[PDB]
Ligand binder design. Structure first.
Ligand SMILES: CCCCCCCC/C=C\CCCCCCCC(=O)OC[C@H](O)CO
Ligand SMILES: CCCCCCCCCCCCCCC
Ligand SMILES: CCCCCCCCCCCCCCC
Ligand SMILES: CCCCCCCCCCCCCCC
Ligand SMILES: CCCCCCCCCCCCCCC
Ligand SMILES: CCCCCCCCCCCCCCC
Ligand SMILES: CCCCCCCCCCCCCCC
Ligand code: NA
Ligand code: NA
Length: 300
């Protein structure tokens, strides 16, 4: 069993590594094809793609009468995206945020503050419907503001668009399967070593759901695509709240997570202030990483 486990683990790392880059490359080309910014493609296609694990996990957990895990994982993912993912990415490729993207981050901040407020006494299915609708509105508003598309499908290099789309799809298949092989491999190794417990198990799952955002953003950062990185942090958090958290609330009332929500609000405000008045570079990234470390050391 340890052999299959090692095999799954290594293969997962390989698929994550090359899949993340193919996903980024395909997504960037697609953005160019359809006259939208990297932020837009990051906040829509890439964000949703990489958040599929959180959404499925939250749905499953709530359906299995574990709403605490459902909301814990969703908000935990948001803290990870800003703290670890953006933190690492900012150092690799410092990001200067233009005016239009600043506006988008501000709207993101309003969304998070709104969710924190209505979730003070937990989330009901009605809160979830509301958050889901706002999720949809955000996406359309983001696409419309970030698209200077001024041509029809007949104006494009359609065979090139096909290649880009296939690269994107295969990339995404790579990162999602890779993330799952990683988790299952590590679980098999832990089981084989007789060191598996529920703490290690849930830690493995929680981190597994975040591996796609992590690898994709790092891949984007190494290619100096800061707008894509930023899009795929902001969009993932909204998809995690408007999508993963909301869908969880549809199966069961979710318990309040006021401490984690407060942390997310503060990190979001920080992110906005940096975007608006400075940059998201080395010491901003250092700060975000320090806050993430404090979070994983002290949050229950
Ligand atoms: C002690 C281990 C000694 C051996 C470490 C070697 C490989 C660890 C592989 C699993 C790494 C799992 C990390 C999970 C983690 O970092 O936390 C994720 C975070 O909670 C998301 O918000
Ligand atoms: C091409 C793959 C390079 C890394 C291979 C690692 C095998 C273990
Ligand atoms: C860059 C990848 C390096 C992998 C190094 C692996 C060393 C042995 C790791 C055992 C991990 C066990 C994980 C489940 C507890
Ligand atoms: C990482 C995969 C290899 C880990 C090797 C640990 C070797 C432990 C040898 C004694 C094992 C006793 C049963 C757990
Ligand atoms: C495998 C060890 C994982 C420790 C958590 C993720 C740390 C950052 C990894 C960046 C690549
Ligand atoms: C309790 C019923 C909740 C139904 C939610 C439907 C969401 C559809 C999208
Ligand atoms: C502990 C590390 C603290 C890092 C603080 C960075 C502040 C950057 C302000 C811009
Ligand atoms: Na995502
Ligand atoms: Na994810």
């Amino acid at each position: 069993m340890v052999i299959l486990g090692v095999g799954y683990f290594l293969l997962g790392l390989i698929l994550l590594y090359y899949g993340s880059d193919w996903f980024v490359l395909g997504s960037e080309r697609i953005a160019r094809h359809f006259n939208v910014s990297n932020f837009v493609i990051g906040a829509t296609v890439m964000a949703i793609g990489t958040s599929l694990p959180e959404i499925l996990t939250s749905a499953y957990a709530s359906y299995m009468h574990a709403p605490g895990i459902s909301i814990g994982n969703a908000i935990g993912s948001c803290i990870c995206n800003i703290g670890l993912v953006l933190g690492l990415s900012a150092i690799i490729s410092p990001i200067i945020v233009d005016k239009n993207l600043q506006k988008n981050i501000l709207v993101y901040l309003l969304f998070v503050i709104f969710a924190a407020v209505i979730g003070i006494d937990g989330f009901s299915w009605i809160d979830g419907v509301v958050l889901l609708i706002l999720f949809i509105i955000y996406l359309r508003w983001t696409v419309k503001n970030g698209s200077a598309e001024i041509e029809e499908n007949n104006d494009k290099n359609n065979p090139s668009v096909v290649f880009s789309l296939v690269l994107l799809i295969i990339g995404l298949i790579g990162v999602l399967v890779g993330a799952e092989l990683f988790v299952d491999g590590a679980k098999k190794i832990a089981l084989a070593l007789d060191i598996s417990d529920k703490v290690i198990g849930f830690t493995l799952v929680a981190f597994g759901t975040s591996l796609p955002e992590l690898m994709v953003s790092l891949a984007a950062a190494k290619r100096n695509l800061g707008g894509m990185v930023l899009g795929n942090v902001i969009g993932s958090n909204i998809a995690d709240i408007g999508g993963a958290l909301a869908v969880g609330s549809l199966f069961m009332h979710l318990p309040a997570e006021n401490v984690q929500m407060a942390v997310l609000v503060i990190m979001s405000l920080l992110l906005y202030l940096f975007a608006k008045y400075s940059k998201i570079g080395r010491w901003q990234g250092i700060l975000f990483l320090a806050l993430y470390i404090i979070a994983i050391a002290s949050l229950r």
